[PDB]
Amino acid sequence: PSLEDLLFYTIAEGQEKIPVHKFITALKSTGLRTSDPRLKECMDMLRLTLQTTSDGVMLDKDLFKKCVQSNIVLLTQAFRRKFVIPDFMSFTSHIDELYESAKKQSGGKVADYIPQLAKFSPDLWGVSVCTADGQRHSTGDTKVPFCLQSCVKPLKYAIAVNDLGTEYVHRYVGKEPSGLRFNKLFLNEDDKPHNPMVNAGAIVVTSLIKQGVNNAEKFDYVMQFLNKMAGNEYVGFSNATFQSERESGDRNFAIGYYLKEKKCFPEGTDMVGILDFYFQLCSIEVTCESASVMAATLANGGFCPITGERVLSPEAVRNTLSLMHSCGMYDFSGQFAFHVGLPAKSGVAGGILLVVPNVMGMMCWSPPLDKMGNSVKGIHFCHDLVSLCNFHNYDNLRHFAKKLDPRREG
Amino acid sequence: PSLEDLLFYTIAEGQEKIPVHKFITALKSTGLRTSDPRLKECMDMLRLTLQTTSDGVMLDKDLFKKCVQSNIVLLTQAFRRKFVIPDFMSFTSHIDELYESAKKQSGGKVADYIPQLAKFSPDLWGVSVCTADGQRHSTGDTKVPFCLQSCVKPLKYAIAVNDLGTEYVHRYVGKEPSGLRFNKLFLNEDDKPHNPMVNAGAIVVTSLIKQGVNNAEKFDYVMQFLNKMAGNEYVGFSNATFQSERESGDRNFAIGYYLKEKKCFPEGTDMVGILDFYFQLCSIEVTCESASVMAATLANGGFCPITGERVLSPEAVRNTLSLMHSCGMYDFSGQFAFHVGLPAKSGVAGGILLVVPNVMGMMCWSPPLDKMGNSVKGIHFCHDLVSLCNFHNYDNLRHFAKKLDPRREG
Amino acid sequence: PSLEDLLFYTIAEGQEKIPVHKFITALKSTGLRTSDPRLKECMDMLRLTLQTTSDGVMLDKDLFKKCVQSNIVLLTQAFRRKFVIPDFMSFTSHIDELYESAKKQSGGKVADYIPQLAKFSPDLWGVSVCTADGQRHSTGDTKVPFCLQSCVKPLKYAIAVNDLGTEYVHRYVGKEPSGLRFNKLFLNEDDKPHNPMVNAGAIVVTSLIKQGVNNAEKFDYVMQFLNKMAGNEYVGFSNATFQSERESGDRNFAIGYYLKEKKCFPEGTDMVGILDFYFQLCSIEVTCESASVMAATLANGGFCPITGERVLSPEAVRNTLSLMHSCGMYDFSGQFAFHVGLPAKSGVAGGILLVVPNVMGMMCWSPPLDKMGNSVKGIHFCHDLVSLCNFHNYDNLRHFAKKLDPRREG
Amino acid sequence: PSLEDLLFYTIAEGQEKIPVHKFITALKSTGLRTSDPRLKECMDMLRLTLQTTSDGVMLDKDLFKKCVQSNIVLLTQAFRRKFVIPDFMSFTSHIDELYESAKKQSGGKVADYIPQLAKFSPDLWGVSVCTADGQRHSTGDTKVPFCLQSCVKPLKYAIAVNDLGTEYVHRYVGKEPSGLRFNKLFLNEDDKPHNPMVNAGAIVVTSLIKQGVNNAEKFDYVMQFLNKMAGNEYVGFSNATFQSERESGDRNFAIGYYLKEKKCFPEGTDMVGILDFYFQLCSIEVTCESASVMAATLANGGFCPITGERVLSPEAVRNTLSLMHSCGMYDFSGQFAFHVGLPAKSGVAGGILLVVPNVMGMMCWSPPLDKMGNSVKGIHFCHDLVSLCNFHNYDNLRHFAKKLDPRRE
Ligand SMILES: Nc1nnc(N2CCC(Oc3nnc(NC(=O)Cc4ccccc4)s3)CC2)s1
Ligand SMILES: Nc1nnc(N2CCC(Oc3nnc(NC(=O)Cc4ccccc4)s3)CC2)s1
């Protein structure tokens, strides 16, 4: 026996030849994209032989082995239906319907407090999925850059705990939600901001990362870190939204000065620089696709699903998922956790970074917000999704009524 | 082939016939108790044939065949290492280590608010486990009765939603936590109590179950309900603590009138009578073993794991597990959700009702309370337990660092 | 010289005789009512001689002397324009203008929570004046009885401090106002109700008066006390409004139990009896005339203006006038203290008990309330009144712009 | 009759000439200082004739007439015991006892947050009085300069209402006290600061004075105003404490931006410039004497008692006294209003600006603060004073038990 050969006959079909395009679409049906980083050596070997023998590019048992031996373990888990979602093909056709039904929630208002999000059309709407195994699906305007805005907070919280530990980080930031009419206070009674998902705690968390280097290097470190979380997919930066956030951040300076007087930053902090770093981190640009991979990184215990690298310590990813659950969706956090029960974080640009732990990561984007600051179509999508699949954090994996479970077969 | 025959060879060793005790301890090693209701027909036939021929109590292939013939499916998941916890034996010696570790947290104060909770010794400490498949382990004082006190709040919430639906119930009770600065208010900003786990919201929920019958039938309806959740193990009632709870409930009467004034009960409610039914529900008695079966019922999508009947609709168990997470441990709810991340509920008698969804239910019981009203040893046990097992709601089931996973084998 | 001789010539006209009506009309022009208690002996001696000599009916110097001998000190200070308001008659024609200007404020809502306050017509409106010297004026429906409701709180506070002292009384009740979204709390941070002018503190003050006797004796004592304060003018009681206050006082029972749980009553308090005494005290009845005398008792350092008896210790009246200033007009206290600056107290029946210290006491009564619970015309009158006279607590008695000062001559 | 002659015989005492010093101590015994501005023409004429004839300094009837003719109206109310406090001589010996009783309350902590108020010794303590008629008394360390700090807030409130009116001003600042549970918020429920006496409300009121001018003239405008309130007595400015307030006002800058975010300033306001003007107004310095004249100005319906000049409209002085009563002493405002019942304002330098309407104005000064920020000795003095005299806003002027009435004989 041999694994690459047994895999050859699984796809060879009993036939003696594999047309390689038949291999490529058998591959994409896994949901894996041809461009997957864990697959490069095999596509290197495929683009090589698509030149060597332009004569009927069918692969025999020996030549197929010559391309896929290097990636055979991941190719076989893909083809022996061992990924977290075995029938990915049907699942995307449910993701499509959920996308198209949220696509008719035309209500809401595009945040216009800056001219940069004000120029974004209300008709943009994209949903991107990446599972814990790297299966990909996207639908809508999923390659348009937009800023993370307030979706950056868990990402930077993760880095801070990843680099410094839970106990150090939470001397400066609380670990609970305020209370639905305490969105107006900055501090809890330990004179600590309530949690990293609000502007007060975000400004404090920003204060802890890479102390002692300048703001240019600090930003560099976060970009390198956010690069690994998305498996080197698109991470960018909008200078335009940066300047309009620095000229308009009256409430943020208010928070900085309040935090400075009440001695909530670590020793030797330059408060006004931290606010400039903060406005920077909120105009890091993503797409629906790249950011869905970062979301899958947290769904996966801190291991990037399309590269296999350890990017965050499991302690950092649990804390962040805990704190997204409670505090992630403004005054809709409490109701969102009850009805949807998925760690999620929203942003002023209309993004929702969603995690379904041990299944998949996601990013939704439609600019128009509802009156609580959450993307209209984005929020409508996350309801239908939990309505449909037993992904609610406190669903039962065995008895779950008329819901669907994508992690099983028949 | 056929099922009773193949298992026979697994236990037979290739020997003879199986000595009946060798079958029994092989059975108990799964963690099932001989008393399991799903096993009654099989133990009835073994006690019969242990009479039919008293010389030579060993079972050949045909005699074993018709003793386990009726319960063969559950016997096979038991013997084929298919229960949710395969090595129950090693795991229980981990529960014992955790138990003996919390047993040295001698601090705290036994609630003295009535002479009935004061009558409990501080060195009582019991932990009882019930998995979603019915494997059991107990350690410590797990047969001593005590009242649920506030551990009854999610149970009646579940019953209320099970009978009435999410939409009706949450017209009278909110679904979020107060906020560590609203632990003293009764009503949230819609003049609904904040959630079913606070005394105000509990009292409101009590006003909803089985409206229109008298308090005697109402009690019967809730007790019959709790009997199915505990698979008919001990569910009792302390009249003694009841008399002390009704004479000392000034704050509850205080809550009762305020709710009446602001019309938070359903029409035709007898407020002062609803307050008696409430005091009753707080002195229903359990032991650690009986109540751990109640907790496993919620871990199990609403199916009693040791009897198999459906007791609660998945909507009832999800909502209840959502709100135990957020609002379950008094003002320690936030830290508990962050650090332990498991649905749980405490009571002033020293109970902690714990749920690890899709795995097991638990009840920890030591009377001495800490400074927030949560049992000292209970809270220490529930910290160590998540430190040890990847049970924190947001652990990753694939990458979980040096934690143990009892759901996996070698 | 001799005083009664001096006074005869002031009225005598240079003439022989003074006709008896000419004395009476000279008397009422002082503003004193002939029925004044400090005048009884003189009108007694007048009704004596209106029989002795039915044909006169003029008094010579020896006979005028025989009627005014007994009351001469008070009669001349009246006639030598030594009363606090020298030209009382012109002053009453300004009170008439103020009354007639508020009488065109037709808005507001009559409190309907009990059927007894709902039966009062919205077109009832009365203003009654009694100065620190006993000059009286009334305009409108000033002899219609109505309940004090919440106007009773200072009256009983005065009695409590009068009998027990500031230091004892204020172990149970604060001395400050809450804060304008804290109309909803019961206790301040020291577990004391905030001040005697809110229902929580009122109920507690009610617990201090005449401890150790039953509720019938306790009420009797307060009636005897309110009797001296109104100089034996009309104080009555509506059992009707009492019965609807006890059947509808859910918030007060709510407050009663909260206070009992937090141990805010004095030892040996029967909580439920205290609430019954409280409902009684709010259904004491007055008219505009009768109650304005109580207000003058507070305007006069604790001495009843129409009897001269010391009824309250000066400590009792300052405290009460202090707390009426801060806390007297529901959420309108702050606005009322700024713009009107007079110690005042309102009630849900539409009463306003007003004090201009060292000048006069008042009672306004119109049933229709504004949106904060204060009678429309009562509030409109008190604005117009302070607009007109330098009566605002922080007016200057020497430089007061274009305002009128009724205590001066020309 | 003749006004000047009638006085001559009252002090002449049956004699033919009045020794000029005998006139002088009879003058000062009313409590007037010879330095009174309303008396200048009369003292000018006295030292002139004290030169014209260095010959036996006694005054006959016709020469006395020519000295006080110009100021005779004020001299007669002084000598016919018609001032608001007739026996000023006995009363000041009550102020002295009250002073020496507060002087032994050694508790409290001198504010140390800037090295400039930390530079003040805790044993400094001074009480200065000014009546509505100009009678003066001082005792203790009453000529030591110190900054008004938060004692300036009602002064600038008054100036804003005097210049703008109650209604305009209170579109930006509330009129009630927070509530002993709202000492940490900036805004009340209408997104307006609670009242002019808190840092948030003061900062906004500061935003209303003399809009459209630069900060240099704005200061000039406020100073000219404070000079008239003190009758041109000492009003200064500490640059030293100013620089330290600009470096350490993190919480004030915190208030500035929050107010900017919530649109609580008038249009075209430069917030950060307003904050420097604010720190400027908070380190204007007074002595106990000069500022005691400011307090009497508010006691006097807006007329400076020692010059006769109208400085504030009665609308501005009433509002300022209403709000001093309610909101004037940090978290002690409630108890202070109950037990003392007098308009007052404190500052972190150890000042208490006190007003007894229609009687007198005052300034107490001892640096060490109690835990609420109010001078220890000052609060002890203001209690003792009201225990003694029926000045409590709601004492009764007719029946007041064992208290004194200095307005009586
Ligand atoms: N009308 C308005 N809206 N929002 C307003 N703000 C309120 C003041 C803010 O500064 C502070 N915020 N919370 C503070 N509270 C604490 O630190 C201790 C603490 C005590 C009790 C409970 C929770 C914590 S202090 C700025 C924004 S004011
Ligand atoms: N939405 C709603 N409106 N009204 C509601 N109430 C129901 C229950 C409430 O009980 C209490 N009232 N005041 C309390 N305050 C204290 O004990 C001391 C204290 C500590 C710290 C800071 C302030 C004060 S506790 C009464 C009103 S709930």
Coordinates of C-alpha atoms in Angstrom, one line a residue, chain A residues 33-309:
Chain A
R33 CA -8.1 27.3 -2.9
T34 CA -5.4 26.5 -5.4
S35 CA -3.3 29.4 -3.8
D36 CA -3.3 27.8 -0.3
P37 CA 0.2 28.3 1.3
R38 CA 0.3 24.7 2.7
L39 CA -0.1 23.5 -1.0
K40 CA 2.6 25.6 -2.7
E41 CA 5.1 22.7 -3.2
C42 CA 2.4 20.7 -4.9
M43 CA 1.3 23.6 -7.2
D44 CA 5.0 24.3 -7.9
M45 CA 5.3 20.7 -9.1
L46 CA 2.1 21.2 -11.1
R47 CA 3.1 24.4 -12.9
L48 CA 6.4 22.7 -13.6
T49 CA 4.9 19.6 -15.3
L50 CA 2.4 21.8 -17.2
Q51 CA 5.5 22.8 -19.2
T52 CA 7.5 19.6 -19.3
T53 CA 4.8 17.6 -21.0
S54 CA 2.4 19.9 -22.9
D55 CA 1.5 16.5 -24.5
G56 CA -1.8 15.4 -22.9
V57 CA -1.3 16.6 -19.4
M58 CA -2.8 13.5 -17.7
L59 CA -0.9 12.3 -14.7
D60 CA 0.0 8.7 -14.2
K61 CA 0.4 7.1 -10.8
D62 CA 4.1 8.0 -10.6
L63 CA 3.8 11.6 -11.8
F64 CA 0.8 12.4 -9.6
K65 CA 2.9 11.1 -6.8
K66 CA 5.6 13.5 -7.9
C67 CA 3.4 16.5 -7.2
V68 CA 1.4 15.5 -4.2
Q69 CA 3.8 13.5 -2.0
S70 CA 5.0 16.7 -0.4
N71 CA 1.5 17.8 0.6
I72 CA -0.1 14.3 0.7
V73 CA -1.3 14.4 4.4
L74 CA -3.3 17.6 3.8
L75 CA -4.5 16.5 0.4
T76 CA -5.9 13.3 1.8
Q77 CA -7.5 14.8 4.9
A78 CA -9.2 17.0 2.3
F79 CA -10.2 14.2 0.0
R80 CA -11.1 11.7 2.7
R81 CA -13.7 14.2 3.9
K82 CA -11.8 14.8 7.2
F83 CA -12.1 18.6 7.3
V84 CA -14.2 20.3 9.9
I85 CA -17.0 20.7 7.4
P86 CA -17.0 17.6 5.2
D87 CA -19.6 18.8 2.6
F88 CA -18.3 22.3 2.1
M89 CA -20.0 22.5 -1.2
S90 CA -23.5 22.4 0.2
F91 CA -22.5 24.7 3.1
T92 CA -21.5 27.5 0.8
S93 CA -24.9 27.2 -0.9
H94 CA -26.5 28.0 2.5
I95 CA -24.0 30.8 3.1
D96 CA -25.1 32.1 -0.2
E97 CA -28.8 32.2 0.7
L98 CA -27.9 33.8 4.1
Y99 CA -25.9 36.4 2.3
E100 CA -28.7 37.1 -0.2
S101 CA -31.4 37.4 2.4
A102 CA -29.4 39.8 4.5
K103 CA -28.7 41.6 1.2
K104 CA -32.2 43.0 1.3
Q105 CA -31.9 44.8 4.7
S106 CA -31.5 48.1 3.1
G107 CA -32.0 50.1 6.3
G108 CA -29.4 51.8 8.4
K109 CA -27.0 54.8 8.1
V110 CA -23.4 54.9 6.8
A111 CA -21.2 56.5 9.5
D112 CA -20.4 59.9 8.1
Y113 CA -18.5 61.5 11.0
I114 CA -15.4 61.3 8.7
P115 CA -15.5 62.0 5.0
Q116 CA -13.8 58.6 4.5
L117 CA -16.5 56.2 5.6
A118 CA -19.0 58.7 4.3
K119 CA -17.8 58.0 0.7
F120 CA -18.6 54.3 1.1
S121 CA -21.7 53.1 -0.7
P122 CA -24.6 51.5 1.2
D123 CA -24.8 48.7 -1.4
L124 CA -21.5 47.1 -0.6
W125 CA -22.0 43.8 1.3
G126 CA -19.6 40.9 1.5
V127 CA -19.3 37.7 3.6
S128 CA -16.1 35.6 3.7
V129 CA -15.6 32.3 5.4
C130 CA -12.4 30.4 6.3
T131 CA -12.7 27.2 8.4
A132 CA -10.3 25.9 10.9
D133 CA -8.9 23.6 8.1
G134 CA -8.6 26.4 5.5
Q135 CA -11.7 25.7 3.4
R136 CA -12.7 29.0 1.8
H137 CA -15.8 30.7 0.4
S138 CA -16.6 34.3 -0.3
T139 CA -19.7 36.0 -1.6
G140 CA -20.3 39.7 -2.5
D141 CA -17.9 42.6 -2.4
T142 CA -15.3 40.6 -0.4
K143 CA -12.0 42.1 -1.9
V144 CA -12.8 45.8 -1.2
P145 CA -10.5 47.3 1.4
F146 CA -12.0 49.0 4.4
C147 CA -10.7 49.9 7.9
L148 CA -11.0 47.7 10.9
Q149 CA -11.9 50.7 13.1
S150 CA -13.1 49.1 16.3
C151 CA -12.7 45.5 15.0
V152 CA -9.0 45.9 15.8
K153 CA -9.5 45.8 19.6
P154 CA -9.5 42.0 20.1
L155 CA -6.7 41.6 17.6
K156 CA -4.5 44.0 19.6
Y157 CA -5.7 42.6 22.9
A158 CA -4.7 39.2 21.7
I159 CA -1.2 40.5 20.9
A160 CA -0.8 42.2 24.3
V161 CA -1.8 39.0 26.3
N162 CA 0.2 36.9 23.8
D163 CA 3.3 39.0 24.6
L164 CA 2.8 39.9 28.2
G165 CA 0.4 37.4 29.8
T166 CA -3.2 37.7 31.2
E167 CA -2.2 38.9 34.7
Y168 CA -0.1 41.9 33.5
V169 CA -2.6 43.0 30.9
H170 CA -5.5 43.0 33.4
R171 CA -3.8 45.2 35.9
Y172 CA -4.7 48.0 33.4
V173 CA -7.9 46.8 31.9
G174 CA -10.9 45.0 33.5
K175 CA -12.4 41.7 32.3
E176 CA -16.2 42.3 32.4
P177 CA -18.8 44.4 30.6
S178 CA -20.0 47.7 32.1
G179 CA -23.8 47.6 32.2
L180 CA -26.1 48.8 29.5
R181 CA -26.2 52.4 30.7
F182 CA -22.5 52.6 31.6
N183 CA -21.4 53.1 28.0
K184 CA -20.8 56.7 29.2
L185 CA -18.3 56.0 32.0
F186 CA -14.7 55.3 31.3
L187 CA -13.6 53.4 34.5
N188 CA -15.0 50.6 36.7
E189 CA -14.4 51.0 40.4
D190 CA -10.9 49.7 40.3
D191 CA -10.1 52.8 38.2
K192 CA -9.4 50.3 35.4
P193 CA -11.4 50.6 32.1
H194 CA -14.1 47.9 32.0
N195 CA -12.7 45.7 29.2
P196 CA -10.5 45.8 26.0
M197 CA -13.5 46.1 23.7
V198 CA -14.4 49.7 24.6
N199 CA -12.4 52.9 23.7
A200 CA -11.2 53.3 27.3
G201 CA -9.7 49.8 27.5
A202 CA -8.6 49.8 23.9
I203 CA -6.6 53.0 24.6
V204 CA -5.1 51.3 27.6
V205 CA -4.3 48.0 25.8
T206 CA -2.7 50.0 23.0
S207 CA -0.5 51.4 25.8
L208 CA 1.0 48.0 26.7
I209 CA 2.2 46.7 23.3
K210 CA 6.0 47.0 22.6
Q211 CA 6.8 49.6 25.2
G212 CA 10.0 51.5 24.9
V213 CA 10.1 51.6 21.1
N214 CA 8.8 54.4 18.9
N215 CA 5.4 54.6 17.3
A216 CA 6.8 53.7 13.9
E217 CA 8.3 50.4 15.2
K218 CA 5.3 49.7 17.4
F219 CA 3.0 49.9 14.3
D220 CA 5.5 47.7 12.4
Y221 CA 5.2 45.0 15.0
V222 CA 1.4 45.0 14.9
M223 CA 1.5 44.8 11.1
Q224 CA 3.9 41.9 11.2
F225 CA 1.6 40.3 13.8
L226 CA -1.6 41.0 11.9
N227 CA 0.2 39.7 8.8
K228 CA 0.7 36.2 10.4
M229 CA -2.9 36.1 11.6
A230 CA -4.2 36.5 8.1
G231 CA -1.6 34.1 6.6
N232 CA -0.1 37.0 4.6
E233 CA -3.4 37.9 3.0
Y234 CA -4.3 41.6 2.6
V235 CA -3.5 43.9 5.4
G236 CA -3.2 47.6 4.6
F237 CA -3.5 51.2 5.9
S238 CA -5.6 54.3 5.2
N239 CA -3.7 57.5 5.9
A240 CA -6.8 59.5 5.0
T241 CA -9.0 57.9 7.7
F242 CA -6.0 58.3 10.0
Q243 CA -5.9 62.1 9.7
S244 CA -9.7 62.5 10.0
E245 CA -9.6 60.4 13.1
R246 CA -6.8 62.4 14.7
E247 CA -8.5 65.8 13.9
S248 CA -11.9 64.5 15.2
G249 CA -11.0 62.4 18.2
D250 CA -12.3 64.8 20.7
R251 CA -13.8 62.0 22.9
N252 CA -10.6 60.0 22.5
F253 CA -8.4 62.8 23.9
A254 CA -10.9 63.3 26.6
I255 CA -10.4 59.6 27.5
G256 CA -6.6 59.9 27.3
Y257 CA -6.5 62.9 29.6
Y258 CA -8.9 61.2 32.0
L259 CA -6.8 58.1 31.9
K260 CA -3.6 60.1 32.4
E261 CA -4.9 61.9 35.5
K262 CA -6.3 58.7 37.1
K263 CA -2.8 57.0 36.5
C264 CA -4.1 54.1 34.3
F265 CA -1.1 53.8 31.9
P266 CA 2.2 52.1 32.7
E267 CA 5.1 54.2 33.8
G268 CA 6.8 56.4 31.2
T269 CA 3.8 56.5 28.9
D270 CA 3.5 59.4 26.4
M271 CA -0.3 59.7 26.4
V272 CA -0.7 61.8 23.2
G273 CA 1.5 59.4 21.2
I274 CA -0.6 56.5 22.3
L275 CA -3.6 58.2 20.9
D276 CA -1.8 58.7 17.6
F277 CA -0.9 55.0 17.6
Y278 CA -4.5 54.2 18.4
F279 CA -5.9 56.2 15.5
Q280 CA -3.3 54.4 13.4
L281 CA -4.5 50.9 14.4
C282 CA -8.1 51.8 13.6
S283 CA -7.2 52.6 10.0
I284 CA -5.5 49.4 9.3
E285 CA -7.2 48.1 6.1
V286 CA -8.5 44.6 5.5
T287 CA -10.8 43.0 3.0
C288 CA -13.6 40.5 3.8
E289 CA -11.3 37.7 2.7
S290 CA -8.0 38.6 4.5
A291 CA -9.8 39.4 7.8
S292 CA -11.9 36.2 7.7
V293 CA -8.5 34.4 8.0
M294 CA -7.5 36.3 11.1
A295 CA -10.9 35.3 12.5
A296 CA -10.2 31.7 11.7
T297 CA -6.9 32.1 13.5
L298 CA -8.8 32.6 16.7
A299 CA -11.3 29.9 15.8
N300 CA -8.2 27.6 15.7
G301 CA -6.6 27.9 19.1
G302 CA -4.1 30.5 17.7
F303 CA -2.8 28.5 14.7
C304 CA -3.3 30.2 11.3
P305 CA -5.4 27.7 9.2
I306 CA -3.8 28.5 5.8
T307 CA -0.2 28.5 7.0
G308 CA -0.1 26.2 10.1
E309 CA 2.0 28.7 12.1

